[PDB]
Design a binder for this molecule. Structure first.
Ligand SMILES: *SCC1=CC(C)(C)N(O)C1(C)C
Ligand SMILES: [Cl-]
Length: 164
């Protein structure tokens, strides 16, 4: 298991633009299109991202390039963020994917706002980190997905993703 298959389980694959759990237009493997409530804005952003007249539908191949682009962006965002990099530096490979999962979902700025949870993780206080992570908007908006990521942080294993 790796960050790519982890996120594929968490995000799924949908070929036509859909509304995420927060009401924002998204497509592919968790690719946020826009925060605007206009569907045409989403199709225009989708057109801009794919470079063709999409009409709200993307191929499976285009979704995987968007996926690779977004994973690359999430990694670069972590490495260039002054508060995310030292925590990422200290984590093992399994927990590094969990942090990238967070940034992939809610962006670099949002994850950096977990001031208490990030200090927990860097000090390898997993149990306490899990408790603090569950007390967030993230946890009650996407509980099933957040529980899997939090379990990954707590145990350092892929057990939350076994048989999924
Ligand atoms: S930080 C994410 C990352 C790690 C590594 C395996 C070196 N990569 O190819 C990327 C940049 C995706
Ligand atoms: Cl890395």
């Amino acid at each position: 298991m790796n960050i790519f298959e982890m996120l594929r389980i968490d995000e799924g694959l949908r070929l036509k633009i859909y509304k995420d759990t927060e009401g924002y237009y998204t497509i592919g493997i968790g690719h946020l299109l826009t925060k605007s409530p206009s569907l045409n804005a989403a199709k225009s952003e989708l057109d801009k991202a794919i470079g063709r007249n999409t009409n709200g539908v993307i191929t499976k191949d285009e979704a995987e390039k968007l996926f690779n682009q977004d994973v690359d962006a999430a990694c670069r965002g972590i490495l260039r963020n002054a508060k995310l990099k030292p925590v990422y530096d200290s984590l093992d490979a399994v927990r590094r994917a969990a942090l990238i999962n967070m940034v992939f979902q809610m962006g670099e700025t949002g994850v950096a706002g977990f001031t208490n949870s990030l200090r927990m993780l860097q000090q390898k206080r997993w149990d306490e980190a899990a408790v603090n992570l569950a007390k967030s908007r993230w946890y009650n908006q996407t509980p099933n997905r957040a529980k899997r990521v939090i379990t990954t942080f707590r145990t350092g294993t892929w057990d939350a993703y076994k048989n999924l």
